[PDB]
Design an enzyme around this catalytic site. Sequence first.
Site: not given
Length: 246
Positions: A71, A160, A163
């Site tokens: 970000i 996250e 991912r």
Amino acid sequence: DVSFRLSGADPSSYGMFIKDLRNALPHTEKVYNIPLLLPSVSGAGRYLLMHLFNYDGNTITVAVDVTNVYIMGYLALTTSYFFNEPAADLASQYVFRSARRKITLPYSGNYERLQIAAGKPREKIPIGLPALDTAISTLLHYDSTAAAGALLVLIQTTAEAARFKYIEQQIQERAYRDEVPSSATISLENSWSGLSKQIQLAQGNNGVFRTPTVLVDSKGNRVQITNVTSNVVTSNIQLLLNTKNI
Ligand SMILES: *[C@@H]1O[C@H](CO)[C@@H](O)[C@H](O)[C@H]1NC(C)=O
């Protein structure tokens, strides 16, 4: 762009958002069937915009670097906010240019600096869909201490989760009740770069990691990942950081 609305959100709509986020990240290659993020992208194409709406329908737009899922900053009403780091400074040349003012946050975007600013490790910060709703609301009105905590929540429930399927599922389990992240969740976050690298190195090494990766599992137990047949590689990780960026 991708979008997520907390109003009426459930594990399904959240799963659709995380799928959209993954699919918006470009790749030309898969390594062991996992999308390999690009070494670089030039100009404005480097940045994905996520439109996030809190329960009351107020919105921020978050800028994400598509090569690493980091970000860079966000827009709230007519004010842009960017991390105090060169990558974000560069991003500020391409996104939210029409903002009436630009604030540079008094920290970079890494977990260590955000935790210092927030006054607590993210082991102690509940995450979930309610925590994300709060995070969005907090970021709407500048408060740099409160914003650090909100950004820890935001990063974990967006990047996250994109991912790692395990993290997406943890957030789905927290659709209506926040809870601090599992130790496994923290471990995966901390190991994304390492795993991305070792999975790429395994390509010319018969699927074997050059250097094992130590993780914590669901049950709180510390385990060694040595090769691509591990569940972390076959089932969990969904995106690889290009080794050119490691
Ligand atoms: C590779 O990892 C698998 C799955 O964890 C493990 O059972 C096995 O012992 C390892 N095999 C090799 C060749 O390293």
